[PDB]
Amino acid sequence: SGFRKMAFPSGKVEGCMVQVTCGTTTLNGLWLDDVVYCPRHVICTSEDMLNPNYEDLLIRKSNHNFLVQAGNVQLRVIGHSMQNCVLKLKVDTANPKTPKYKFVRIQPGQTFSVLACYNGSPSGVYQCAMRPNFTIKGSFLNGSCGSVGFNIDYDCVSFCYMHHMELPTGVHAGTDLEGNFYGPFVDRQTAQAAGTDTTITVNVLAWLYAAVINGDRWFLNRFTTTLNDFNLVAMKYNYEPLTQDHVDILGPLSAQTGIAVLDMCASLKELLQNGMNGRTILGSALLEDEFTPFDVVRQCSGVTF
């Protein structure tokens, strides 16, 4: 029993973290096979930040201007390439610790674990969600750039996020591992609107199912609703619209608890309209939207890696 914000075991990613330095700037890189991946703004200096011409800046760099350290081991850089907003440094040694891996571009509302790193050394691991507006609400200090987000499936690491920057609003922005930003963001020091966020409705419902499985059931009610009716309430409260695809992915949790999805929607509707009256659900006084339906079943089933 119990329900925690649980991250993946970080060992397979820890063995991939290196330090990348280019002149003044140091940050983290990801060493997989014989390539190191890192944010391209490693080649900026403090006067480039407002609008760097990354092509012009990279042209002034040669292989030997990039220092890559894996623990105490020095990697020899034998090629460099820019792909979108990431730098790819070819090194002359394949990482002996390379896990089986893929690069994925996740969808808003999906979750992943973050291994926060400084100077190529891991400091902590935590779980978060890609917000509907393509920010993440992370914990990142100066120098955390190049930290990565990932999911693990048995033995295979799916890398989905590389950290690039903090916005003036204190939330975080980054790229997939092909260097394409999530959302509208660019890697320069300008004010950048993230735009309206919403609550991930399918995740809230998943977490209510997790609550019922753990015995927290006071919120269950005598009502039901329709998808159209519920979506009227969702929009009033800035929740994402629920689709039949969402209902389908909630099927296994509905089967385990015996609570039809539209009946759980009616419970959520009443919680939105009436609040929680100073009660809690799974230790929380707010509705939590950072657990996917897969997250709930994995934690309520014991899947290992």
Add this chain to the structure above:
Amino acid sequence: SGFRKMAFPSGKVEGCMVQVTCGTTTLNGLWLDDVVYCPRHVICTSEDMLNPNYEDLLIRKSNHNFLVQAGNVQLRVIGHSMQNCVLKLKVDTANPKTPKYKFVRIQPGQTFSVLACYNGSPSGVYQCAMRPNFTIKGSFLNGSCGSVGFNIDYDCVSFCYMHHMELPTGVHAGTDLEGNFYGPFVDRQTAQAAGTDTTITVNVLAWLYAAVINGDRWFLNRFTTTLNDFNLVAMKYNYEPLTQDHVDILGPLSAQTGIAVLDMCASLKELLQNGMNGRTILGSALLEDEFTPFDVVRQCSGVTF
């Protein structure tokens, strides 16, 4: 910026997790040097549970009755001993992945990371606190027994918790690595009172400082208070009494924010007496007590390992 419930990177502990089998029962063990540590109730069968005679049960076992598997391959058990509530299986191979480590017994109110495992394989990592009543509010399914809690300091792992059981109330109990239970619990299937829990006051204050550091400040008020007067309110709201030692360990956070400890106490007093009125602090609608003062400084300073 940002503040998350951050666990330690779990890589150094992942390489120590093995599967232990004694007849029917399988759980997790911790392989350090040439010894495997696991809960002694691995030697129980399903009729033993109400009050096992562990001495008698262990006498009917010999070295070859214990099967230790580290991923692929079996270890050879060459000795066995019971220490309090843990079994120590001497194996013929020192773990090549043994990190530098210590065994520590932690104090109520301290935090640690848990690596939840099943069948010797890591499934997830999360941070938690030893409650004042010596339970933990974990996430543990059947077979999680033997999962361990730990802290890391640079390269040294301090193991502080081994998971043993879930109480009928849904909370979790375990031992230090010398096999001494935290709290009054015994490893048998009986109803066991955990007794009254309290909120860890010094941790709540620490988290309020983390909030101010991250810009959340609506709760700072014009009042101050005394240690005596604050403890009056603390006792009404089932908070641990604040001592001068607690004031002292909050010193670094008080200095970094310019807010004297007793001033933060007056803010907490007003929060306890008036609630939050639909506001949030660091994304939470409850007062959080699972971050120690050291947890805050580490996450706000970027200490690596």
